[PDB]
Coordinates of C-alpha atoms (C1' of nucleotides) in Angstrom, one line a residue:
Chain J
X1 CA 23.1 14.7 -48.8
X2 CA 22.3 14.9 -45.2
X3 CA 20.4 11.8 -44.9
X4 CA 23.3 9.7 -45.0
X5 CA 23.7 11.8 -41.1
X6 CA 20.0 11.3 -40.4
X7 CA 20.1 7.5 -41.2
X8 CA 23.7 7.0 -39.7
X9 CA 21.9 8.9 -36.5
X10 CA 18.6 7.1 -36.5
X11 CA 20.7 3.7 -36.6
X12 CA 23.1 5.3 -33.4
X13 CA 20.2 6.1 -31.9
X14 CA 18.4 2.8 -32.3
X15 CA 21.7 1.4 -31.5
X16 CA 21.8 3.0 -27.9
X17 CA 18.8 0.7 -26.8
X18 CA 19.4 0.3 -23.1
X19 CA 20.0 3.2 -21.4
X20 CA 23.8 3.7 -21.8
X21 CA 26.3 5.6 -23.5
X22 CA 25.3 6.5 -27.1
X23 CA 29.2 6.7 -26.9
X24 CA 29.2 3.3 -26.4
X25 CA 27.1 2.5 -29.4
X26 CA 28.5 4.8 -31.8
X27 CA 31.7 2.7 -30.9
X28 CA 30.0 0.4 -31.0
X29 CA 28.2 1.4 -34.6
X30 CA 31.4 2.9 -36.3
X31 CA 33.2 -0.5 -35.1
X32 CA 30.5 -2.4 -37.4
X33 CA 31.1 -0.1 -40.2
X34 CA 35.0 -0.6 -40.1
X35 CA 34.0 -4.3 -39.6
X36 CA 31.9 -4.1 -42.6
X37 CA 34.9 -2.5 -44.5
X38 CA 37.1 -5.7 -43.3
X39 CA 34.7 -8.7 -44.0
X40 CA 33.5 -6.9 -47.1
X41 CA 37.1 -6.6 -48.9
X42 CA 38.3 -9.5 -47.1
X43 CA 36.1 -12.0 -49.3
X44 CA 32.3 1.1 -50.2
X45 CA 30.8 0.9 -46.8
X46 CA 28.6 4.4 -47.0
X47 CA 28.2 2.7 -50.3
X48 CA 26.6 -0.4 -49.0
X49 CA 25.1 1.0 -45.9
X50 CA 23.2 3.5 -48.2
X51 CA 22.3 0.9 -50.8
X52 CA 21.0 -1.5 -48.2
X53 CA 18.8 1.0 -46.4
X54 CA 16.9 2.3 -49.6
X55 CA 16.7 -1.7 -50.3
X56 CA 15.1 -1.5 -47.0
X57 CA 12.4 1.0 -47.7
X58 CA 8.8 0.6 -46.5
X59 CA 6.7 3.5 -48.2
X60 CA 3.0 2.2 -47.7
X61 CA 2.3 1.1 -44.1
X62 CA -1.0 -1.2 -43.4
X63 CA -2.8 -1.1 -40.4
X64 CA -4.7 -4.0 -38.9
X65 CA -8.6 -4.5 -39.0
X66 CA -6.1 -4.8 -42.9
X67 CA -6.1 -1.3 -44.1
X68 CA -3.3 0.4 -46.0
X69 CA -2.2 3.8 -44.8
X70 CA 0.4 6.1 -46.6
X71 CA 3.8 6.7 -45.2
X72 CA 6.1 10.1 -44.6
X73 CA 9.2 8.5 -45.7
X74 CA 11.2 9.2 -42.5
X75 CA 8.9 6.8 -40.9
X76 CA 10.0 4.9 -43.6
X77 CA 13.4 4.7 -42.8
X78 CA 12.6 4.5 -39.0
X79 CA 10.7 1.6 -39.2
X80 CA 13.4 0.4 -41.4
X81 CA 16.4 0.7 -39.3
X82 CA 14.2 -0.7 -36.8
X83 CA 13.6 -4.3 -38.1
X84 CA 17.5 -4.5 -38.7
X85 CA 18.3 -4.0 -35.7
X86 CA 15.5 -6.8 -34.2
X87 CA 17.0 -8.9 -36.9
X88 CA 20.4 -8.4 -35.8
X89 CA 19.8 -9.2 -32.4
X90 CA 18.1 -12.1 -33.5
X91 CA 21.1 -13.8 -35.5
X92 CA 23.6 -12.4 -32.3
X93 CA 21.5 -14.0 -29.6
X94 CA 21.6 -17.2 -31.9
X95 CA 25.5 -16.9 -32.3
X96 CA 25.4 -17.1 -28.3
X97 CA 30.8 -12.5 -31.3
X98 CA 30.3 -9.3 -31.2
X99 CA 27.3 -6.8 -32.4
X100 CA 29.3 -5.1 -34.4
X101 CA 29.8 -8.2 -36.8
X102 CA 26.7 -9.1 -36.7
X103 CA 25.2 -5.4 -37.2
X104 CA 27.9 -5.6 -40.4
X105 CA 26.8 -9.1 -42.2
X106 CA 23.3 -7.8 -41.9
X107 CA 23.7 -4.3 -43.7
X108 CA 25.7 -6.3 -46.5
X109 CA 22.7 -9.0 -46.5
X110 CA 20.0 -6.2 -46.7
X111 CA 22.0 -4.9 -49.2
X112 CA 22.6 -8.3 -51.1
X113 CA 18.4 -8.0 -51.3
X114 CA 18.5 -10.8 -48.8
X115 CA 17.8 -11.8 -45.0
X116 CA 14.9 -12.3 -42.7
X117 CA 14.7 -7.8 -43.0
X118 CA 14.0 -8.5 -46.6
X119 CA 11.6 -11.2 -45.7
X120 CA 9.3 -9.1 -43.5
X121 CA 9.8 -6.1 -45.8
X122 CA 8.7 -7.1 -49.0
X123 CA 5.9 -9.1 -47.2
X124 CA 4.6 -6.3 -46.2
X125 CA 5.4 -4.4 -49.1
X126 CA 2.8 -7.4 -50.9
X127 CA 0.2 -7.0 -47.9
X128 CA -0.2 -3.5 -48.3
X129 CA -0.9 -4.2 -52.1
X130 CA -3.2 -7.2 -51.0
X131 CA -6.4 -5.8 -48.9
X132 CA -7.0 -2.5 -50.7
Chain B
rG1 C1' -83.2 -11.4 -26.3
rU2 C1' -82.0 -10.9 -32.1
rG3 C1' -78.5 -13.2 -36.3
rG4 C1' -75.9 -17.7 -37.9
rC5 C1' -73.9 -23.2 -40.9
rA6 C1' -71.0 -21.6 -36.9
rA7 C1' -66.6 -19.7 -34.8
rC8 C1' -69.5 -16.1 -31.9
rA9 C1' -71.3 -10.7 -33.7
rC10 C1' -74.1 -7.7 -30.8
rU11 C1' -77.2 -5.3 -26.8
rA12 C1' -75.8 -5.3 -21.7
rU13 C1' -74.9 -4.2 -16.4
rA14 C1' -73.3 -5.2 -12.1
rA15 C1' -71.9 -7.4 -7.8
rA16 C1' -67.3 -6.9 -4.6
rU17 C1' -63.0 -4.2 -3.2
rC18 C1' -59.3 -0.3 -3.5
rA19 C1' -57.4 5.4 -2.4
rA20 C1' -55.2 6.0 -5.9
rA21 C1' -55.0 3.8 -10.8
rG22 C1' -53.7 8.0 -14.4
rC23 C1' -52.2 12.4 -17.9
rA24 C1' -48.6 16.5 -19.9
rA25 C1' -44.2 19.4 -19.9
rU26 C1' -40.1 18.8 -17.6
rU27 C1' -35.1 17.9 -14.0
rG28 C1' -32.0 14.0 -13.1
rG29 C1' -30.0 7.6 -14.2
rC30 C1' -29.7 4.7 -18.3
rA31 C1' -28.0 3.8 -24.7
rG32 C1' -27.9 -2.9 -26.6
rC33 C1' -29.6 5.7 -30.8
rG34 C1' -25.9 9.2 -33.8
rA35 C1' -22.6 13.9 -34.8
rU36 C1' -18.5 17.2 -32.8
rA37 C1' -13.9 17.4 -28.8
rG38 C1' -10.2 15.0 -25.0
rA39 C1' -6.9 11.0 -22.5
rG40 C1' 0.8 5.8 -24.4
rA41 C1' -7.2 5.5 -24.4
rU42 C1' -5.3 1.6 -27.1
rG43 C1' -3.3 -1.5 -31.7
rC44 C1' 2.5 2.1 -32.0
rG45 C1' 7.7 1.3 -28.5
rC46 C1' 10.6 0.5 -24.0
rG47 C1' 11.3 -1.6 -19.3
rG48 C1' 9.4 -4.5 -15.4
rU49 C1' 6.4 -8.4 -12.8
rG50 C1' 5.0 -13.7 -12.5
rG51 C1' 11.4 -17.9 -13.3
rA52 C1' 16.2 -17.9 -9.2
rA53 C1' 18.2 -15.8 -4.4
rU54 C1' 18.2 -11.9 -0.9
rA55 C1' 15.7 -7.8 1.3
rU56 C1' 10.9 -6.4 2.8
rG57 C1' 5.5 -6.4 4.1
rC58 C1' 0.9 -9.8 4.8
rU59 C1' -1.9 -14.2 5.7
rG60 C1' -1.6 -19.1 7.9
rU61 C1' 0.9 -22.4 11.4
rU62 C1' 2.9 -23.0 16.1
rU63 C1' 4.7 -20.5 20.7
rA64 C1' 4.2 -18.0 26.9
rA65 C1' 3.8 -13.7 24.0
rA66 C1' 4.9 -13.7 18.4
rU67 C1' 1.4 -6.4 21.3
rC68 C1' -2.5 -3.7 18.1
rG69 C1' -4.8 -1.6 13.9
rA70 C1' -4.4 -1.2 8.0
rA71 C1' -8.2 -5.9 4.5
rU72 C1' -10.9 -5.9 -3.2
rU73 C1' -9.6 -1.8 -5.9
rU74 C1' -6.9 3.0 -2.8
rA75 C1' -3.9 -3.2 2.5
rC76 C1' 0.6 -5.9 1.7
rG77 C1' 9.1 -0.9 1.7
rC78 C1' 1.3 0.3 5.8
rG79 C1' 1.2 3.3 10.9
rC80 C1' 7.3 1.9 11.8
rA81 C1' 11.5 8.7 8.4
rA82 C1' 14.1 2.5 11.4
rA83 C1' 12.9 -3.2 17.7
rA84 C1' 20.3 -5.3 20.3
rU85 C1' 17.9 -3.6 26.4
rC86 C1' 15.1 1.1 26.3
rU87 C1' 11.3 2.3 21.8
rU88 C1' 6.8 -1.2 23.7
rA89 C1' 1.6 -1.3 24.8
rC90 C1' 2.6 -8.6 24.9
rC91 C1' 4.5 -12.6 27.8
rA92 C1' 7.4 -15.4 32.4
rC93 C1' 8.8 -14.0 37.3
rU94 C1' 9.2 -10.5 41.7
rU95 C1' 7.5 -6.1 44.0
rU96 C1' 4.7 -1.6 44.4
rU97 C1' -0.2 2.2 45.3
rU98 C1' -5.5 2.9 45.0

RNA sequence: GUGGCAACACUAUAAAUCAAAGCAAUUGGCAGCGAUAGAGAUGCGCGGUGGAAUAUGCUGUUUAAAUCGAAUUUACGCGCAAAAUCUUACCACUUUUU
């Protein structure tokens, strides 16, 4: 049950970024999950959160040469939490909002199986199965 | 000189020079020869540079002097942890003592 903290932290953490408050971020996070909560019942955030981060799970990793190497599954989510967050500045750098709605739409789209996170994912996912 | 169909196969010395040409175990430098260990050593991340302006140092140009050294890494926020005169050694001018 405490992976719902280790996740939530890992994406605080990952959140922080530039060498400023993690207070600021984890404003700056929880304002994304209420945010979530807001465009999600406007047209079950844990929920979604949770569901769109074991969506988002890499277990085999593959290493260039392209060799496939197993994965500890906190790496997993690391990695994970990781290429949402470079997504999500991705689509907020092209909307120049704030993070937080952009931090939101993407853990509903990861969650929705969908998104560039999903793209790179499962490619990977299919790589890994390719050069063993 | 002997053999052959021959390519040439022998047998076979020297003239002339040199003061070493060599040999074996090493001890070190190489590896475009492997096994074991160690370094963000990378491919793993973050933030820079190089884009703009300012500061600052250096070359080069000129000026009377832009005092003098530092010069590829390790020089270039270096001697200077500080130049408005003085610091200051360089120049223009006016004097001074050997």
């Amino acid at each position: 049950x405490x992976x719902x903290x280790x996740x939530x932290x890992x994406x605080x953490x990952x959140x922080x970024x530039x060498x400023x408050x993690x207070x600021x971020x984890x404003x700056x996070x929880x304002x994304x999950x209420x945010x979530x909560x807001x465009x999600x019942x406007x047209x079950d955030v844990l929920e979604v959160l949770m569901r769109a981060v074991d969506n988002c799970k890499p277990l085999m990793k593959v290493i260039q040469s392209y060799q496939p190497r197993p994965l500890n599954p906190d790496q997993s989510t690391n990695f994970a939490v990781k290429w949402i967050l470079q997504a999500a500045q991705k689509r907020r750098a092209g909307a120049k909002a704030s993070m937080a709605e952009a931090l939101a739409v993407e853990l509903l789209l990861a969650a929705q199986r969908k998104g560039g996170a999903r793209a790179r994912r499962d490619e990977v996912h299919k790589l890994a199965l390719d050069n063993r």
